[PDB]
């Protein structure tokens, strides 16, 4: 398996979201994306929830996340696995919706992920 580089997709006041990709050779239709949330700010992240969506031609499942909190100052990250099936090799598009609390603010972020590697779907 050739390695596919991680993609940093979001940063806000010290909170970051990062994507990692795996394309198992033994199942070409399959893409496994791991989102990883880190926090280097002075305040905990709480109630973290990530939702995702792909084009209708693809199928998406989310595994339960490792947790809903990311402690301040480089605390334990949250990881969450996305399972995507794409047998027709349609261009991968991915949008994310994040909600969490941080510095006593309710954060709501939604965006389409740009610069997805072609290796994640070809």
């Amino acid at each position: 398996s050739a390695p596919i580089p991680d993609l940093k997709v979001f940063e806000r006041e010290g909170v970051q979201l990062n994507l990692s990709f795996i394309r198992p050779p033994e199942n070409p239709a399959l893409l496994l994306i791991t989102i990883t949330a880190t926090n280097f700010s002075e305040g905990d992240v709480t109630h973290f929830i990530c939702q995702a969506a792909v084009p209708k031609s693809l199928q998406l499942q989310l595994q339960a996340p490792s947790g809903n909190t990311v402690p301040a100052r480089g605390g334990l990250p949250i990881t969450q696995l996305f399972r995507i099936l794409n047998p027709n090799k349609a261009p991968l598009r991915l949008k994310l919706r994040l909600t969490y609390d941080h510095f006593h603010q309710s954060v709501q972020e939604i965006f389409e992920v740009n610069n997805l590697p072609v290796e994640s779907w070809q």
Partner: peptide, 6 residues
């Protein structure tokens, strides 16, 4: 065109 939020 887009699927549901998961």
């Amino acid at each position: 065109e887009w699927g549901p939020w998961v």
